Amino acid sequence: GPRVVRIVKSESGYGFNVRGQVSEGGQLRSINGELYAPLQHVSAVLPGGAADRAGVRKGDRILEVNHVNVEGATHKQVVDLIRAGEKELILTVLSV
């Protein structure tokens, strides 16, 4: 099931990478029996960073950023939403 993680930004950042489609049109994928449009995913977590300590895990598939749905979004759309957090980030994710 989707879970919600709060990450407070440190002076060095959030400590995670996001990878996903540049443009819309990617393949659909079934997760936990539910069909989803393409989801950007957490591709790396800095050990001991803010995201790591908050419980973000590698492979986490991002459904929402600050309660804005990003299912099927472009990479730039997700990047821009994360940067608009400005010292706090709420991720709704589907972990592997």
Binding site: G13, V18, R19, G20, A51
Partner: peptide, 7 residues
Amino acid sequence: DDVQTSF
């Protein structure tokens, strides 16, 4: 394609 960004 797939692209990556660091936060």
